[PDB]
Design a protein around this nucleic acid. Structure first.
Ligand code: ATP
Ligand code: ATP
Ligand code: MG
Ligand code: MG
Ligand code: ZN
Lengths: 396, 618
DNA sequence: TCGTGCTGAGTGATATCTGCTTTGGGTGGGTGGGTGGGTTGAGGCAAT
DNA sequence: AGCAGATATCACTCAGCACGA
C-alpha cells in the first residue's frame, strides 16, 4: 500500500466546515436555525447550499483570513464530505427547545439501558448513524452565483448520459434527461440490531454494501468472559432503515448524435428525496457519480469492469367565445369552422349520465373524421390531442 | 536495464524530431488555457525507420517490449515540459500517462480480418474493415486511492488486466483494500481514484473483397480511454493495434475439450476514418467558379451515371435528393422534413437498379436493401444482448443506420405488408418507436428513400389506370415526393442510339491492362462532365454551407403552378394534393442549394415546377 | 469407612486445518434436464 | 469468502491404591 502526498488536509477542511456552520449568516445563523429545527423533530432533511459556501469563502478572503477552497474540494470528492458534514452537525447539535416523549422511542430506552449496564460493569458505544434523524444533501453551485464571483460551475452544468465518463466518478455532477422507469419505495438497511439470548446485551452492525453476512455468535464482554455460547438473532424493531428508490434516466432526442442509439443511466434515491421522480418527466438530477463494486465470486469473475449509478442530491423539474376557441384550436390549418366546433364539443364532452336504472346513456360525444388524403387530419388529431389533458395519440 | 536503454533511445529520437515536442507543447498549452485534448501523439513510422532501424523494427515485430519504453519517454518529456504552478489533488493522484499513436506504411503488416493468422500474433498490424457491433461504454478501474484518518496519509493500489497492458502481469482482483498494513481502517476516495473508459467493437471484412463462396470474417478490437466512441456500426475504419492472445485456451484442466484454441483480439492504437473529403482553398474556389455557370444544374445532372443513356429528369431528381432541402421545425411542434423521396415504377431493363447502385456509391452515407431480403425488425431495430456487459440493448437497423443519409430499396413491390408498416411509419414520422423487452425509446430516422418497383403485370399498361398498375397502398405512395413512370418504347432511332452506347461502354478497358486480361495500401495515416470526386466535394460543400431562404417571387410562381396543376382537366399519373406544394418548395430549395444561393429565386421555382410537371404528366 | 493426593489410559470434545464451488453464461457441457432460469427473430410446416 | 469434512492435540471422568483414622 504505497502512500502519496496529496495537497489536502482534512482537519483544516473540517474546521472550515464547522466555522461555516456556526458563523455563516444570510437574525441568527441560517444553518444553526436549521439544526435547531431538526432537534425539535420539525425537519428531517438538511440541504447545504454551495452558494453559501462560496459566499463564506469570498467573505473570508476579503477579511484577509484566506481559507481553503471548500467548494472545489466538495465538488471533486463529495462522498467524504457528506460524512464530514454529518460529523460537524453532530458535534454542534443544539439542545432541544420543545419537550418530547423520549421514552416512546425504542432506541432511547435501549441506549439508556446499555448505559446502565455499562455503569454497572464499571462499578464492578453505538454507530453515529444509528441515532441520526436527518438526511444531508448538496445543492449544486448556481451558474449566476459562480459568474458573479468569477468561477466555473461544473456541478450545475447539465450533461448528457454520453458526456458522463469514467473520469467524472466521485464528483458532484448534473444530468439532463427523461425518466423512463421508477421502482417502488423499499426499506434499505443501514444499521442492524441483534440480541443475545443468554447475555441480555444488544449488538449492532453497519451495512455499506449490496450484501452483508449476518452475525451468528455473541461478541459481548460478558459472553466472552463467561464462555457462554450465545446466538445472535436479528431484530427489525430497533434497526435503522432508509427509503430507497431506483430510477432510470434516458437521453433526450436532441442529445443523441447522428446514427446513434440513446443510452440510460441508473439513479439511486435515498432519504426524503423519494417520490420526487416519476416516469415521463424531464428533470435535472444532481448527484454524486459513484461505482457499485460487486461482492464475492461475482467480484472475482467480473474483473475490472464496474457498474455505476447516481446518488440523487437535488431534482429540478422542468415546466363569440365559440368562434374564437374554434379558430384557435389549430391556427396553422385553413379555416374549417364546423370541424373545429365538433372538436370543441368532443373535448368538453358535457353530459348528465345518472339514469340509475341499470345502464346510463354514454357520456362521450365521439367524433369520427373520414376524408380523402390531403385534408389536415393528422394536424387536427395532434392539436386536439395536445390540448386535451388526457388525450392519447395512437396509430392503428 | 534494456528498458532504460530503450527509453533513452526513444528520448533521443523525440529530441531529434521537434514536431512531436511542438505538438505536445501545443496540447499542454490548450489544456492549461481552458474541451480538452487527450494525451495522445501520432508518430510517423517512416521517420523512426530513417532515424533508428532497430527501434522501428522492434516496434513493428515486438511492440510489447518497445512501445512501453516509448510511452514512458514521451510521458517524461511532457512532465518535464509541464510548468503548472499548482497541481490539483486529482491531478497529482491521476494516472494519465501519454499514449503513443502510429501512422505511415505497414509493409506486410497491413492486413484484413481474413488474412490475420497465428503468425501475426504479438505484432503491430493494421486492419481494414466495416464495424458491425459496438459494445456499451463502461468505466474500468486501474488505480484506487484510500485514506487513513488516524495516520492522515493516503494509500493507493494499482490494478492491471489482460487488455490494459501489453506485457503480462499477475492478475489483480478488483477487491478494494479495506485495512491498512498495521490494521488501520481505510476509506475509499472515489474522487481521487482513476477510471478509464472501455469498449469492444467487431470489425468485419468488406463483403466485396471476400473470396468466392465464403462469407466475410471478423475480428474483435478493444478501445480504451479516448478511442472509446470514435466509431459507430456501418463505418469503414482502418484500425492499428497489437494482435494479442488471452486466457488459458483450454490448457487448464477444467476444460476437457482439448480441441479448442486460444482467444484473440486487437488492442487498438488508432482509428482512421475512411467519409468526409477535406476541402482545400483551390477546391472551394473551383466549386464557386463552377457554380457561377448558368447551366451548372445541367452539367451536374449529366455527370451522374455517365454509362446510363437518357433518364435526364431522373438524374436531376437524384441530384436534388442528394442536395436535399432545408429542414424546419416549428415552435408549436410541427416538423417539416427537408428530405426528398423518389420512386420509379417501370418495365424490366430500364436502368432502375443501376441508378440505385450509382446513388449508393456516390452518396456519402447510403444503405442498400431489397424487398425480399429485409424484414420489419431488420429495418427498424433488433433487441439483443451485450457480450461485454450482458445488458439488454438495441441494434440499429437499415433505417436507423442511414440517419441523415439515403436508403435504397430495390424490388419495393416484392415486400410484405408487415414489413411495409415499418417503412410507412419511418417516412411519415421520420422516427422509430420501439416497445419490446421493457425498452421504451424513440430512434431518429431522418433519411431520404429512393426505391424502384415493377407493375403488377410486369409491364406498364397505358389502357389501365395508374391505380390498377401499381399495387402499393395509396397512403404509402403519397409520401414519395416524385413518381417517375419509365417505359421501354421501341423506336428505331432510340434503339440504335442505346445499342451504340451499350456497345461503346462494353468496349472499355482499364488503364494498365492488356487486351484479354481479366479484371482482378501503401500508407495508412496519409458541356464537360465533372469527375465524381469533384461532384462529391461539391455536394458536401453545398449541403454543409448553404441554407436557402424563400422569397416572394418564388412563392408567386409556386402558388401559380399549384393552382394551375391541381384544377386542370388533363389527367395526372399521380393525384394532386397539398403535399405537392411542400414538394415544390423542397425542390426549389434544393435547386437553390445547387447554385450556392442564399435565397430561392424565380429560376428555382420554374425548374421545380418543370420537374414536377414532367414527373406527373410526362 | 472419609480425605488427599498420585497414576492412568481411556473416552471423549472442541479448538483447530484441508478442499470445494459458487455467479450465472457458453472462457463447464448436451450420456445433468426443458416444469431451475435465459427468449426475441427467423424459419419451415400444417390447417386454413 | 464461505461452508462442510476431517485430523490431532487438548482435558476430564471413573478408576483404585497408599496412609490414618
Ligand atoms: N388546410 C391545410 N393547410 C395547410 N396545410 C395543409 C392543409 N391540409 C393539409 N395540409 C398539409 O398536408 C400535409 C399532409 O397531410 P396530413 O398528414 O396533414 O393529413 P392527411 O392527408 O389526412 O394524411 P394521411 O396521408 O396520413 O391520410 C401536411 O403536411 C399538412 O401540412
Ligand atoms: N439506358 C440504359 N443504358 C445502358 N444500359 C442500360 C440501360 N437500361 C438498361 N441497361 C442495361 O440493363 C442491364 C440490366 O438492367 P437493370 O438491372 O438496370 O434493370 P432494372 O431497371 O433494375 O429492371 P428490373 O429490376 O425490373 O429487371 C444493365 O446491365 C444495364 O447495362
Ligand atoms: Mg394522417
Ligand atoms: Mg432490378
Ligand atoms: Zn452474549
Amino acid at each position: 500500500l504505497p502512500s502519496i502526498q496529496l495537497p489536502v488536509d482534512y482537519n483544516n477542511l473540517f474546521n472550515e466546515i464547522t466555522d461555516f456552520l456556526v458563523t455563516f449568516k444570510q437574525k441568527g445563523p441560517k444553518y444553526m436555525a436549521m439544526l435547531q429545527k431538526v432537534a425539535n423533530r420539525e425537519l428531517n432533511s438538511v440541504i447545504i447550499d454551495l452558494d453559501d459556501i462560496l459566499q463564506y469563502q469570498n467573505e473570508k478572503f476579503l477579511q484577509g483570513t484566506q481559507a481553503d477552497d471548500l467548494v472545489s474540494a466538495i465538488q471533486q470528492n463529495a462522498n467524504h464530505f457528506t460524512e464530514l458534514f454529518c460529523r460537524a452537525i453532530d458535534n454542534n447539535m443544539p439542545l432541544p427547545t420543545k419537550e418530547i416523549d423520549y421514552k416512546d422511542d425504542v432506541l432511547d430506552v435501549i441506549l439508556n439501558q446499555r448505559r446502565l449496564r455499562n455503569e454497572r460493569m464499571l462499578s464492578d458505544l453505538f454507530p453515529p448513524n444509528l441515532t441520526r434523524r436527518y438526511f444531508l444533501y448538496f445543492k449544486p453551485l448556481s451558474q449566476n452565483c459562480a459568474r458573479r464571483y468569477r468561477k466555473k460551475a461544473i456541478s450545475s452544468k447539465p450533461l448528457s448520459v454520453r458526456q458522463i465518463k469514467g473520469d467524472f466518478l466521485g464528483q458532484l455532477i448534473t444530468v439532463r434527461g427523461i425518466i423512463t422507469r421508477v421502482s417502488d419505495v423499499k426499506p434499505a438497511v443501514e444499521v442492524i440490531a441483534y440480541t443475545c439470548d443468554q447475555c441480555g446485551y444488544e449488538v449492532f452492525q453497519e451495512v455499506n454494501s449490496r450484501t452483508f453476512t449476518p452475525l451468528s455468535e455473541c461478541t459481548s464482554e460478558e459472553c466472552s468472559q463467561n464462555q457462554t455460547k450465545g446466538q445472535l438473532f436479528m431484530s427489525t424493531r430497533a434497526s435503522k432503515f432508509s427509503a430507497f428508490q431506483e430510477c432510470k434516466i434516458q437521453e433526450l432526442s436532441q442529445q443523441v448524435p447522428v446514427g446513434h442509439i440513446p443510452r440510460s443511466l441508473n439513479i439511486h434515491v435515498n432519504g426524503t428525496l423519494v417520490r420526487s421522480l416519476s416516469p415521463g418527466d424531464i428533470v435535472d438530477v444532481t448527484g454524486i457519480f459513484l461505482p457499485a463494486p460487486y461482492t464475492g465470486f461475482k467480484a472475482l469473475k467480473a474483473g475490472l469492469l464496474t457498474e455505476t449509478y447516481l446518488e440523487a442530491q437535488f431534482v429540478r423539474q422542468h415546466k363569440d367565445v365559440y368562434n374564437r376557441l374554434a379558430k384557435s384550436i389549430a391556427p396553422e390549418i385553413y379555416g374549417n369552422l364546423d370541424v373545429k366546433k365538433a372538436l370543441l364539443l368532443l373535448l368538453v364532452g358535457g353530459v348528465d349520465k345518472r339514469v340509475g336504472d341499470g345502464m346510463k346513456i354514454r357520456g362521450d360525444i365521439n367524433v369520427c373524421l373520414m376524408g380523402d388524403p390531403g385534408v389536415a387530419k393528422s394536424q387536427l388529431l395532434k392539436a386536439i390531442c395536445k390540448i386535451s389533458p388526457r388525450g392519447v395519440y395512437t396509430t392503428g | 536495464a534494456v528498458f532504460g536503454d530503450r527509453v533513452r533511445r526513444f528520448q533521443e529520437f523525440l529530441d531529434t524530431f521537434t514536431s512531436y515536442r511542438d505538438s505536445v507543447r501545443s496540447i499542454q498549452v490548450y489544456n492549461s488555457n481552458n474541451n480538452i485534448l487527450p494525451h495522445r501523439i501520432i508518430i510517423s513510422l517512416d521517420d523512426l525507420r530513417e532515424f533508428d532501424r532497430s527501434f522501428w523494427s522492434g516496434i513493428l515485430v515486438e511492440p510489447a517490449y518497445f512501445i512501453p519504453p516509448a510511452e514512458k519517454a514521451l510521458t517524461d518529456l511532457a512532465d518535464s515540459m509541464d510548468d503548472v504552478p499548482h497541481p490539483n489533488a486529482s491531478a497529482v493522484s491521476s494516472r494519465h500517462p501519454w499514449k503513443l499513436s502510429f501512422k505511415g506504411s505497414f509493409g506486410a503488416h497491413a492486413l484484413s480480418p481474413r488474412t490475420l493468422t497465428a503468425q501475426h500474433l504479438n505484432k503491430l498490424v493494421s486492419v481494414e474493415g466495416i464495424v458491425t457491433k459496438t459494445s456499451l461504454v463502461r468505466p474500468k478501474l486501474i488505480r484506487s486511492v484510500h485514506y487513513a484518518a488516524k495516520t492522515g496519509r493516503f494509500h493507493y493500489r494499482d490494478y492491471t488486466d489482460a487488455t490494459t497492458t501489453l506485457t503480462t502481469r499477475i492478475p489483480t482482483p478488483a477487491i478494494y483494500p479495506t485495512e491498512d498494513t498495521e490494521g488501520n481502517k481505510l476509506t475509499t476516495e472515489y474522487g481521487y481514484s482513476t477510471f478509464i473508459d472501455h469498449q469492444r467493437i467487431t470489425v468485419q471484412e468488406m463483403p466485396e473483397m471476400a473470396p468466392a463462396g465464403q462469407l466475410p470474417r471478423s475480428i474483435d478490437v478493444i478501445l480504451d480511454d479516448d478511442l472509446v466512441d470514435k466509431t459507430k456500426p456501418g463505418d469503414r475504419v482502418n484500425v492499428v493495434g497489437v494482435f494479442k492472445s488471452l486466457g488459458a485456451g483450454g490448457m487448464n484442466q477444467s476444460n476437457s475439450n482439448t480441441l479448442i484454441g486460444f482467444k484473440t483480439l486487437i488492442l487498438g492504437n488508432t482509428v482512421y476514418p475512411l467519409a468526409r473529403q477535406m476541402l482545400t482553398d483551390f477546391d472551394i474556389r473551383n466549386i464557386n467558379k463552377l457554380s457561377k455557370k448558368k447551366d451548372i444544374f445541367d452539367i451536374l445532372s449529366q455527370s451522374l451515371a455517365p454509362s446510363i443513356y437518357g433518364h435526364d429528369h431522373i438524374k436531376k431528381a437524384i441530384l436534388l435528393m442528394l442536395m436535399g432541402g432545408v429542414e424546419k421545425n416549428l415552435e408549436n411542434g410541427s416538423h417539416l422534413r427537408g428530405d426528398i423521396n423518389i420512386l420509379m415504377v417501370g418495365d424490366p431493363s430500364t436502368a432502375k437498379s443501376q441508378l440505385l447502385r450509382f446513388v449508393l456509391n456516390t452518396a456519402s452515407l447510403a444503405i442498400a436493401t431489397t424487398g425480399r431480403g429485409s424484414s420489419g425488425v431488420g429495418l427498424t431495430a433488433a433487441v439483443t444482448t451485450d457480450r461485454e456487459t450482458g445488458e439488454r440493448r438495441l441494434e440499429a437497423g437499415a433505417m436507423v443506420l442511414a440517419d441523415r443519409g439515403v436508403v435504397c430499396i430495390d424490388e419495393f413491390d416484392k415486400m410484405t405488408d408487415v414489413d411495409r408498416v415499418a417503412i410507412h411509419e419511418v417516412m411519415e414520422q421520420q422516427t422509430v418507436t420501439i416497445a419490446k423487452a421493457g425498452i421504451h425509446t424513440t430512434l431518429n430516422a431522418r433519411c431520404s428513400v429512393i426505391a424502384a418497383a415493377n407493375p403488377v403485370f410486369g409491364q406498364y399498361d397505358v389502357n389501365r389506370d395508374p391505380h390498377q398498375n401499381i399495387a402499393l397502398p395509396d397512403s404509402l405512395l403519397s409520401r414519395f415526393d416524385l413518381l417517375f413512370v419509365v417505359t421501354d418504347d421501341i423506336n428505331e432511332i432510340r434503339d440504335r442510339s442505346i445499342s451504340e452506347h451499350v456497345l461503346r461502354t462494353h468496349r472499355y478497358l482499364p488503364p494498365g491492362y492488356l487486351e484479354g486480361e481479366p479484371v482482378r495500401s501503401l500508407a495508412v495515416g496519409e458541356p464537360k462532365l465533372v469527375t465524381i470526386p469533384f461532384l462529391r466535394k461539391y455536394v458536401q460543400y453545398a449541403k454543409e454551407r448553404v441554407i436557402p431562404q424563400l422569397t416572394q417571387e418564388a412563392i408567386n410562381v409556386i402558388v401559380k403552378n399549384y393552382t394551375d396543376l391541381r384544377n386542370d382537366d388533363n389527367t395526372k399519373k399521380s393525384p394532386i394534393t397539398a403535399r405537392t406544394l411542400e414538394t415544390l418548395i423542397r425542390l426549389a430549395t434544393a435547386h437553390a442549394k445547387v447554385r450556392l444561393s442564399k435565397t430561392v429565386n424565380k429560376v428555382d421555382a420554374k425548374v421545380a415546377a418543370n420537374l414536377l410537371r414532367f414527373a406527373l404528366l410526362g
